Amino acid sequence: NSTLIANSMHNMAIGTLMQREVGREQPGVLTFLSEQYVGDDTLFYTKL
Amino acid sequence: QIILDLKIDPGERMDPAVRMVAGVVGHLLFTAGGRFTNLTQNMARQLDIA
């Protein structure tokens, strides 16, 4: 009943991990402006 | 022999009320009296601001 919800929210967790790691390893190189998750797809708008 | 200080982490995201409550808690928890101290002057300033 909640396949899409589970996949998207798992994607949300994975996204939070990648943002945390990239912020830790390189401070200030990449700043995230927007994040979206749908199904198995993710999208980030950032400033380089 | 051990003195506390504040930790800064940009990646952490917390509700603003946590700092405001911790400001009250720190005054009742620690000692900065005239004989010994538990915290650095900077942490005392941060707690006062909170």
UniProtKB/TrEMBL annotation, chain A:
Coiled coil: none annotated. It comes from the Viruses. Belongs to the reoviridae RNA-directed RNA polymerase family. This is RNA-directed RNA polymerase. It comes from Bluetongue virus 1. The lineage of its organism: Viruses, Riboviria, Orthornavirae, Duplornaviricota, Resentoviricetes.
UniProtKB/TrEMBL annotation, chain B:
Transmembrane segments: none annotated. It comes from the Viruses. It is found in: Virion. This is VP3. The lineage of its organism: Viruses, Riboviria, Orthornavirae, Duplornaviricota, Resentoviricetes.
